[PDB]
Design a protein around this ligand. Structure first.
Ligand SMILES: [Zn+2]
Ligand SMILES: [Zn+2]
Ligand SMILES: [Zn+2]
Length: 274
């Protein structure tokens, strides 16, 4: 991986438009073609799940309005993890709306500083700093009106990476949704000068945890996590909701664990003096 390539991709597919849509029950997709953002409609206002790159905040606000929502009705902002491709609009939206920001406790310093962990002087990974109103840990519950989400600590990709669980209806039946936080290696350093202390252990705890969770609908902060576009194509009035795939988090976490092993080996070999 190169940071140049990360930025190149980040300034292309990550900023390209995608038509917003009702995904399941009160969960609506309002992200880009490469970064997933969601509105959760409650009886007491909107919950915003993540934002996108700093340059894309206007696009996200536009997508919200395209669905008939008001940006002003956002009361809570939740974060999966504190990297600029997910936090770029937090300061702006929080100021505009007066919403409270909720995030994993170990990501609080990242959010409040607007920097990438272990690469804190890199301005192309910086974002506008934002205050955290509530810092969460494993099992904490966050409620707006009729809707409650449960925090799960799934560190590795960031130290405070938080996967959020909530129940939706599919017809008469409950289905459990996870907004998985990310388990990719991406720009992180695993060995040598690791991005943060204990990162390797965190990733492997997270892959195992993910495989053991009872989840009907896998979501995530990039559409690639759950094959969003292919599922959207299969949506049809009266047909089963294609986002319900209860074995998918096991399959996806297995693919992540296998890639993790590859990247750990690669970085370990790269540390050898040549
Ligand atoms: Zn990230
Ligand atoms: Zn990301
Ligand atoms: Zn948990």
């Amino acid at each position: 991986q190169t940071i140049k390539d990360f930025l190149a991709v980040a300034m292309k597919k990550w900023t390209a438009p995608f038509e917003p849509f009702q995904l399941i029950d009160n969960i609506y997709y309002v992200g880009t073609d490469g970064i997933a953002v969601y509105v959760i409609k409650t009886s007491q206002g909107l919950i915003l799940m993540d934002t996108a790159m700093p340059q894309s905040t206007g696009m996200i606000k536009d997508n919200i309005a395209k669905l008939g929502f008001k940006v002003a009705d956002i009361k809570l902002i939740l974060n999966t993890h504190a990297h600029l491709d997910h936090t770029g609009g937090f300061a702006e939206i929080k100021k505009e709306t007066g919403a409270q920001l909720v995030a994993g406790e170990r990501d609080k310093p990242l959010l409040e500083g607007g920097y990438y962990p272990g690469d804190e002087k890199n301005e192309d990974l910086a974002f506008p700093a934002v205050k955290v109103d509530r810092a969460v840990k494993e099992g904490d519950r966050v409620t707006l009106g009729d809707t409650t989400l449960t925090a799960h600590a799934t560190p590795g990709h960031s130290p405070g990476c938080t996967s959020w669980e909530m129940t939706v209806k599919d017809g008469k039946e409950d289905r459990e949704v996870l907004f998985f936080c990310s388990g990719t290696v991406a720009l992180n350093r695993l060995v040598g000068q690791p991005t943060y202390a204990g990162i390797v252990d965190d990733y492997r705890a997270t892959f195992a945890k993910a495989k053991a969770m009872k989840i009907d609908v896998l979501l995530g902060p990039h559409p690639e996590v759950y094959g969003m576009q292919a599922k959207r194509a299969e949506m049809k009035d009266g047909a089963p909701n294609p986002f319900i795939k209860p074995g998918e988090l096991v399959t996806y976490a297995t693919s992540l664990s296998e890639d993790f092993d590859k990247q750990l080996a690669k970085q370990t070999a790269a540390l050898e003096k040549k």
